[PDB]
Design a protein around this ligand. Structure first.
Ligand SMILES: Cc1[nH]nc2c(NC3CC3)ncnc12
Length: 143
């Protein structure tokens, strides 16, 4: 088996996130789709690709999903908040819960100039050991 690969997902539409949770699908930018497609295919089913979702300006992460398919680049147009989001891949949301950035901001990414994980861009990949730290904090956070 292989350890998971873990990516930050950012959205500036809460409605798009709602749709993602309801129907277990997502789409990124062109370069973001390529990045996730490469990772999913190179895993070759021997470990998961995890996605850590966060709405721009919300000050919190909102949950965790697993990538469940390769990217399909030719799908129905205009299904998201804006037309610029093209293509589709399946996801499985593992859990949905808000976790304040304050709980995560001291985790820094050595592959992103040691910036805090909470300052990441869409499809920023997370080093394994930091991803474990983030996932355990998110899993155990209590309001
Ligand atoms: C469906 C979708 N995929 N990426 C999205 C996004 N990314 C912005 C950079 C933060 N914003 C809104 N909807 C999106």
């Amino acid at each position: 088996m292989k350890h998971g690969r873990v990516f930050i997902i950012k959205s500036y539409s809460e409605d798009d996130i709602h749709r993602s949770i309801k129907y277990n699908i997502w789409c990124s930018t062109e370069h973001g789709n390529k990045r996730l497609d490469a990772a999913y295919r190179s895993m070759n089913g021997k470990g998961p690709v995890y996605l850590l979702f966060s709405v721009n300006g919300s000050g919190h992460f909102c949950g965790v999903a697993e990538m469940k398919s390769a990217v399909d680049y030719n799908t129905c147009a205009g299904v998201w908040s804006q037309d610029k989001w093209k293509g589709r891949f399946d996801v499985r949301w593992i859990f949905v819960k808000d976790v304040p950035n304050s709980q995560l901001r001291h985790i820094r990414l050595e592959n992103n100039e040691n910036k805090p994980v909470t300052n990441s861009r869409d499809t920023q990949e997370v080093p394994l050991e930091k991803a474990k730290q983030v996932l355990k904090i998110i899993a155990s956070y209590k309001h």
